[model samples]
Target chain A: RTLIVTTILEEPYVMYRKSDKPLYGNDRFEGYCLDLLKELSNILGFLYDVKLVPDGKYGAQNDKGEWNGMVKELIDHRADLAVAPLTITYVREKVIDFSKPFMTLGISILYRKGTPIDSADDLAKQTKIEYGAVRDGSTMTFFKKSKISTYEKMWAFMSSRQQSALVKNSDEGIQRVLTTDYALLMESTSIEYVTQRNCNLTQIGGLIDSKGYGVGTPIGSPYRDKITIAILQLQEEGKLHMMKEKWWRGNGCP
Target chain B: NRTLIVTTILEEPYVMYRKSDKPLYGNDRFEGYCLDLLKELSNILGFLYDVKLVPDGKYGAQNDKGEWNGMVKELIDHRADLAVAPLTITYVREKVIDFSKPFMTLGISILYRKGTPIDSADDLAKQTKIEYGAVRDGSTMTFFKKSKISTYEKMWAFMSSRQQSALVKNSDEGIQRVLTTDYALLMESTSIEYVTQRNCNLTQIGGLIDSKGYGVGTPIGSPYRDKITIAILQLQEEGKLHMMKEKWWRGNGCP
Candidate 1:
């Protein structure tokens, strides 16, 4: 069981174990990520132990370009892999490396029920209600859309109307949509999870600024090629669809 | 064990009454998506089908005496081996017949004269006297020519004191009417796309209204269901069905 995987807590992804008695090591976690880990382990023929990083953040490059959280542990070799809901970013992978991306995520809007708008036509033409993403956070950088030049004018028109309309977190944004004439811009994956819980809320438009998630490891890990083939096989068989539907909408809390 | 008696209807893009001065008969007389798809099924599964149009021209519905009509009736009657038209696979029809996996997914759409103002359900409902119609099954009169209604023939009671939707002879007549009049033809979108691409003056209006699929039909528990479905699914996976659609619906489309 020495194939150590460093994971972090994330809803619907790596759900922390809920039991009267404490869970030890791998038995403590269950989610889409854990299920995926089981499948990957079965295919790749590996024995694995999961350890959570004490800090609850995914990972980010710091002011001095130093890594922290799961990324830091990966570079330090304290864990052999990072397998939570970690986004594979260029900055994160430069320090180590990642297997092929498994899924893509993007920004989307959640609107209140009875709203007539379904696509970009109405949003592009009018600015009657407030709309926002979380300020100084992961969701807002989509306004610049990492090297997508088309975002420039759309962002300009949006900020002209937004004028500090940003919220602090996803819940606040969701709440604003329910109580006021507002739309909340957040990760589409999170939006999907929220919509299944709240019947009155619905996601609008297609995904904005798609990006990927992948298994991560230290630079030059020999396991990369083997992991890539397994992920690619799963992609071909359409196995990811079943897992996404199961965890996101199947058994859930209101 | 013998040649499959495939029941079908003649409609644009799915199967059509091929026009020629030469010997146009049997399979040679019809050419469209269903024709091409049937060709592939025979190629893969190694069976032959004798293609013939459904009598009465109804997709199928049960009558008061527990009898069926159209392609569905023929299959129920064992007069044919397959009903391969763009027959809509519906719950009511499903109870009486077994359909292969839906080969083509479709939905309802509006076909109208190009310059007509309405494009949505609301807009049409807002302004009345904009006549709309559905295709009906054919009759003995239908046997005479394409003029007899070549599409699904549904009956209507015209009083003038007239019905809002007049009963047309067939889909061809309905589509032909839209090209020249203020009327709208309401039908499945697959045919709508085919008709619109060829006649730029006639266009489809609005998004799809209802979602459904069309399938090749065989009588209940026909042994060929498994073999036929495997071929359809394989073509779907290999992109041959998509390519076939483009060839028939778009290859001969507007220049």
Candidate 2:
């Protein structure tokens, strides 16, 4: 039996394979998440159909508290699993189940390696450079709710220019940073992938807060703990580290 | 409303007795992060609880006969309604009991005297001059025993083969060993943070070996489980969890 999996298109996580010839089903995709799915399927003994999340957004609750994207799919029983970089947050966990973290990360700044901006304090003090996070993403939520003085100031700046500051996704934010004087606050793991591919961009500081990305399932799904056990197995066997190296390895930046 | 029996242990900061000039009784006798946390859970869920310590001092482990001891067995046997402690949410333990989302995240790390040449687990695994072990029957010891990685497997061999029994009875015993001997203790990073804060001469020597969390434990299918989890999430979003941690984990200046 095949289970439908909801995922998003993010470079190095999920991406359409470069093909002149057409590909189909799971074969149409190639990336770290795909490899992870393959490994999981091997261990768990299940077939999977990977579907792109229709709305092109990771799960977030709207003003009326209606969920959307991958999360809603799990909530409505439309997908068996959400195999993406979905963060395991308190709000999300209440509505769905998450396997133990497949990866750990923290919020950080992504900017050009060449700058006086070594840390967030430099960004907070100056108006010459503007910084923001992906709208409705966990990184932005961290800033929105943060009470720390430096982060509070940064959030104030972003909220005041909401229309211009916030971007729709990591790709959009990365492009904005490259084309303009904008800095993007995103997950440190994403920064690692982006910085590996782009010599110009670098992580500005240490992690702002620690969290993890976990595989999502419908609440009370039988597969949740099974997935957790398999992840632990993979971790202890060094398969997780090897898979990370396979995807994240890139030619050295000059 | 019915009163739930909450089982716990006497781990510093998580659960401990408050000093007083006058006598304290029952639940009033205990004060620490866990007690504060239990009070908040009770407040949010409107349930009263009777606090009792686990009869056995162990946190919980399955023995050769497939028997369990410590706080875990209490939940499995329905002897206690909830387990509020620094209980690690691990794969083996999750199989037997339900756990709330992690209230605190930590991992195993090295605790050694200041100026120890060791900087990582590898440093210890490669040499025999310095002895390193974890609290017996604790999650740290389980990690080494269960680990498949070469470094951890090697470390486990040394621990199990030592003539003096490298494992200590508890964190206090391990800390004593570190203070009086050329020994390094493998323990939870959170406990190491508490130790290094109080004894400036001791320091955490390396990064965490693995990441996990301390979660509130409940029996399988317990009605209170979901309610307690929601309350914990509520407390987390409201920043009360962090507040409780600061209240308990803050220590005197290292200088």
Candidate 3:
């Protein structure tokens, strides 16, 4: 009933440890990546080699034309696992393998014009900042789960936008919502819970659809169903909700 | 035959007040499904009785302290001989009083504004943006304990949270609340069905949540319990009950 897992950290996740030599492999680094590494380890079944990455890093073409970072490891066959917040900027297409993500975020159709780049209803809407989907963490999953002609309906909308609206996380999205003409389209749960105490923002229209986290394995990893099923059970049992409530409602969130 | 005091709640369809200001006697002022049933029961038992609305007009729901209130109290207090209303059958009520075989079954349901997407408890649980309301000390609130969806939390939160703040004295008020906001009320399916049939703009989400029924309640061992129970059965055996239900419940004016 147990699967042992090994995860090396990356981001942008690896942090450093100050030591004579070290206490253990974990003594080497820590961050949100390791945090998720721990979560997946529990649900997916495993003892993580939370030590370090032989993991993903961003990839790009060189003067000599080569991939680097995670993409390099992926293409050159250096690593079996490349799980991180890495985005489309580096490895933008399906070459050797591809898998689904479990979470999604997107562009805001609308919001309160404290500065929406602004407005909706009878419904004329607006914009400002670069209005793009989160290259990886946000966009892709939405297109996957979306049905009822919504996927392409939404993509057509995202594609037609003039400004580059894509951003990384709620952190980045809220930053723009606060400082610029940025209209972030994503988790309204995050926006509403911001009722925690912000007075500046409110969502308009609606969240496009559902999307989020995932497990990507090389074309033939035996662990796929284990990943999908565990997530489903976690969702139905409200464990996903129970965990979010723990983190979101606690005094420190705002 | 001697006169027996019958107690009931001011619930719609089952026992509603007549509109005229003209004074009417014991079964005359009230006009509803229960009124007809009561009149027939009196004929069956060859007895005379007075139909009185329980002082608080409650079908005996328990409070936080587990104290009985409404018609249940009237029967327990030895003031009323029968408690009849669309009072749902609940385990807690059985100890302080007993009930005849179920006369009508119901499920917990949602009443939403027309064209709204919500259709079941799962749909209601998934969102918080739309408001919901419930009546205090009413069968609708008591009915939730047996609900299939875990509205246990959401239901209580709505009940306790003062947002749907105006304490509804009855289902009519709660149904009225349904019209004013994007409010969805978790109510008995019977009530929703009754309302939707009458109002073209409102709709009932047909899915069932909790399934149970309403019965004629009597304080433990009231002799008339058996007398009324037989009268109800004779009515049921002769199809009079079903005919009566359809006439008052689904009959009359409705969409």
Candidate 4:
């Protein structure tokens, strides 16, 4: 059996079956990405199975070769592919081959209604606005680098005005910004979810950068390009768009 | 008497008059950042000028008689001595006209709902959920097309859903759509403060997706470009640029 080393993250993407005996690739893992992967397997003639790796063990196992984790699962020839919404970045790109970006998104700002920030310029010029994002998320990293002109301006304005602060997670950031005058920096998708729940908050501007999620494979995997090309072809054929709209558009995916 | 026929777009708060439909009185009419800068420059140069509100595209077109329309045409045809107002200096325009040093820099900004997850162009380039809209032939549209970080291929993949909807005609419409829609982002300049003010739900990010400056333009061989540039530079040196910003942005005298 070609064990498809998979990790389950909660909802709208992948999850475990909530039955008496939780099983992988059961009813609970029904997401657009999952369903699409099933279709890909059917079309490409691959027999695969899923395994749920603990969230804490997921990253390190994928990085170092010692653990029988998702990353090592592929390296040790235990799993054929890791089909989760695992994000692809330069660091990860080094250790694992990833398919062409399956999904693209980035970090962005979320503010309460009536926040004075209009553009990055306004945020940079104003002294009172605070920013926050997930602690380990790319948004936080982008804010930390602060090399981009807008980010630098924002840091300068915040320092001069003593108005900027950072926090972790959409819930914490949104709550802080709502309670106070601080603005939260978060994933655009997460921010959109929070904004939908709260009428007073809104997303300001657009994404500050771009990132993509891809299927992870062992380093130097020759099939990476083939998989990437297949994904792009699917996208061009409108299958990807259909999947995205089906999953992300409606009142919350199950 | 040589008339300094200034060509201006009909954008509100920049050139248009308030309450009554008549053009602003020359002394009281010219009343924006550009106008205030021009006023200061005139004070320094000891020049009097007449303001003309012309069609937006009139200056960019040419007639069979080799005459351009509006103030630029007026200057080219030797009918006016100089042209001013929030006229942007482009390289093509520079070929036909000379522009003074830029007085103000502006760029396109992505205006979305307060909680929408977009912060910059790179973000937009990757996401499939959000739709980006910009005015056709506007600064934002040009930036969307010309950005190095966002390639044409990536943009096509990301913006395929937006297609014709990606481009609009004016900033106001873009702002309106963003106010009501969930997955839409509009690209406009920092100047659309009114829309953002009215719709508190909309906010701008800090990053400049693109940047350009506004300059005072004159017909080629007008011999005033050097003088204008010097006057603008002098204003900058004298801290008058900051003063003009305050006067024009906060004065609220037009109405």
* Interface root mean square deviation per prediction: 18.7, 3.2, 24.0, 17.6
Predicted candidate 4: interface RMSD?
17.6
Q: List model 2 lDDT by residue over A1-254, tens digit each.
A: 89999999987899999999999999999988999999999999999999999998888887899999899999999999999989877678889988878887778899987788888898999999989988898778777777778888998999895457889878899999999999999899888888989998989988766677889999999898788777766765567777888898886676
Docking class of 4: incorrect
Q: Candidate 1: where are CA atoms >4 Å away?
A: A1-254, B19-25, B115-117, B137-161, B251-255
TM-score computed on alpha carbons, candidate 1: 0.48
State the displacement of the C-alpha of residue B42, model 3, in Å, after optimal TM-score superposition.
Answer: 2.2
Please state what fraction of the native interface contacts candidate 2 reproduces: 0.21
Candidate 4 TM-score versus the reference: 0.44
lDDT of 1 by residue, A188-252 (tens): 78888888888788888886544456787887677754565566455434466668878877425
Error of 3 at A155 (Å): 64
| Model 4, residue B246: C-alpha shift (Å) | 2.8
In candidate 3, clashing pairs total: 25
- Whose lDDT is greatest here? 2
Score candidate 3 by TM-score against the native.
0.47
Stretches of candidate 4 above 4 Å error? A1-254, B20-30, B56-80, B146-149, B156-163, B183-189, B192-198, B250-255
Alpha carbon lDDT at B105, candidate 1: 65
The digit string of per-residue lDDT tens for model 1 on B124-196 reads 6455477665564422111111212212122122201254345466778888878777777766788888887
- TM-score of only chain B in every candidate structure: 0.82, 0.97, 0.87, 0.77
Clashing pairs in 2: none
Sort by DockQ, best first: 2, 1, 4, 3
TM-score-superior candidate, 1 or 3: 1
Q: What is candidate 4's lDDT per residue for A1-254, written digit by digit as tens? A: 45465665633566454578755344556676576677666556566666666443344322343444466566665556777766554434445666645665666778877755766556666555655455544455455444556776654543443333655444576678879877777666666556655678788888665455678778656555456555644543446656766656544422
lDDT at position A252, candidate 3: 35
> Looking at model 3 chain B, which ten-residue stretch has the lowest summed lDDT?
B142-151
